[PDB]
């Protein structure tokens, strides 16, 4: 019943949301699509982005040793960080020539990064950024935290994706990001170089964080405020295929250039997974329309990418009307990272059918209010639905890979829901681990407040409050709730009594 | 007796009346006040009541039966508020507009032209516009002269984040009336509403109690208003900006409302302002008490009328400066007078006011004042003679007067009948001797959400049951019916309702 002794307890972070913020300004990375996106005049006036700027952030780039000690002090034994591609290669790697292999239908089944390609990439990489990430990773290991390294977390180098150019011309001029197959080739070089660089201190790799968010938000949901903020159906399907293609070739390249077991316990020297945000879809009724909309949305967001990278089954229509198998894409995943925040309740609409989305549940509730199921609601308007964690893991379990909960958290700047959020969700997780025994860790989002993308700093996810002026960390009560659960390896009934539904 | 076309009616606001729908499809979460009353810190510290506007009386869906109720008791006029946040839930800052700036920094022109209206129409929530159009049309169908208030305290969250302002002491926003851009955006909103509603609306009100917004916002935190700061610098700036916003809105309403909905209206756009006038009684005839009463009367009652009637600007708010802008003179067609009670004060040397307890707004709720008068549930002294004194202060500026608010928090309805009879016989005497008051709007028709106090303060002539939303008229609604329908206070009624012995 208690969580197994080796169960991972930690937090997740990303480069763009954490790193910048130093007082002297020396650590600013202006060379991402997201950096240019949040500084865009038009985006700011329109309310597409918050107007907050990442360069005023919490300064994880220089303060990482303090945050790591904070994480250890509350019983964390694991931690995920993101590497900013734009930091390693501020200037294009397009001139390193590299052998490639193409499937009949056009997919890249192989990017031949050899010794000479590594040498040329070593001459283009920012040695300063590499050594800092090494110092970051080594500080985790020194404090006894197992390191998870994510290679891409939304942001792309500006020479890979200029979102203002893509938006203004509707993808006539670029660089076009994941719409362009060239991005697959460069991401493959970047992945190979990082595995060669850090393979001796990293065993748990992640290629992409929420790749389906990058594509949906970038090309089919402009309301969410992501670059390039278009609604182009063919560009959405192309980016999905390309980013899924990129994972496969990076998976093989990481396996080639990471042959060192940093930890003797690691299941292999290069244990490569993907972080995927799973949303349990709940049909509003058992009517045809509602059931058909739920099935379709579950297929596109939850299942489509996993059929690609685990089964090798490609559906270029994104709606389940086509199946094309590439044997070389089969079983290209070692473990799966499950991000869960809340569910979606949907209706089906006659059009063929299209999701409607019912309000009062899931992602569409009254901020600070109560959902129609009697659950508290975050500052983001998100329903606290702890049972959905079990639903999300059941969907993930279909693909037969070991699971880790890589993100789970709440926007709550005053911390009056987060303790119950931790107690209720970890109760569900504890029973799930004993029952199904295929989940091996819990990574909370996050240790500290950070820059919540298009929402800026006004969404506070941290177990620790951060004063943006002084960069001072002030742990919240929920950090103690986390400490108790992680240290005692169980959810004590005391915590269940003390933190009921607020 | 009152003249034949004397206005008998009531006033209301969007935030205090609209929400309540059980589903509830009408929830407007995008105001500073919505986030303000849902704030757990405010609720925990007693800043706000803990009651939520989503559980209110649902005037948004039930307006037809409330208007029939109003006409049922002899009303011929009704003031409603438009929620800016409902019309423009997303920022309008990218709708570019030419502006003119006085050398002292005041915005003298906001060039809302036809192109600006078209772009604003692309952003407006057409569902909200049509509902307000329905509410106004239903009022006309019952012989109720419509008064439309453009702003009644609440602001869009993209205009004012009161938590960010409070937490950061105005270092992070958006900052509402502290920021001059609010004037520009309010000007665009006023121009759009005149364009869209001008053929059905002739009596316009820019702001309801603007000095209450700034005073309670930036110099009186115990009132419980957002952002709950005390900051005289911000108090001055907000006073100047909201007065600036009235003048430009006045000019743009008259530009885009060229249609006389009623052929006997004074003009196509009769633009007024609703100002709460507090008769200030010095405690004694000493210099200290007289100097403090003069200052208090100047800052609260007179300062903003010096701004928008005479175009005289006082940057200090204490009578130390004098700046004339001819572009600002006579920017007012009529003056709505809100009167609730007086203030008795002393002067203390620091000369600032020292409010004498037992009179006016500072009595023990449900008790007796030191002048022997009944006291509302709010702790407000019932002082009907102050109505004549408040209209005297109003009369100095040479504009037609309408009593736009007058009422009492009295859930048991044991004082309201005397309150009604006594205030209105004072008003009747004033009307025949001064002949410059043309209406009486009671606050309010039904119980509503009384801001920081929630539903505890019941001002309605009609009680409301929040479980079923059922309206239950009080005895005092019959008193109002008799007085309004007979166009005089029958001496029978003065006998029935004398000043109670407690
Ligand atoms: Mg390794
Ligand atoms: Mg008109």
Residue numbers in the entry:
A (entry chain A): 1 to 351, 359 to 509
B (entry chain B): 2 to 351, 360 to 511
Excerpt from the paper describing this PDB structure:
Beta-glucosidase is an enzyme that catalyzes the hydrolysis of the glycosidic bonds of cellobiose, resulting in the production of glucose, which is an important step for the effective utilization of cellulose. In the present study, a thermostable β-glucosidase was isolated and purified from the Thermoprotei Thermofilum sp. ex4484_79 and subjected to enzymatic and structural characterization. A similarity search was performed with the BLAST program; the TsBGL protein was found to be a member the GH1 family. Members of the GH1 family have a (β/α)8-barrel domain structure that contains the active site, and the hydrolysis of the β-glycosidic bond is carried out via a catalytic mechanism that involves the action of two conserved glutamate residues that act as nucleophiles and proton donors.
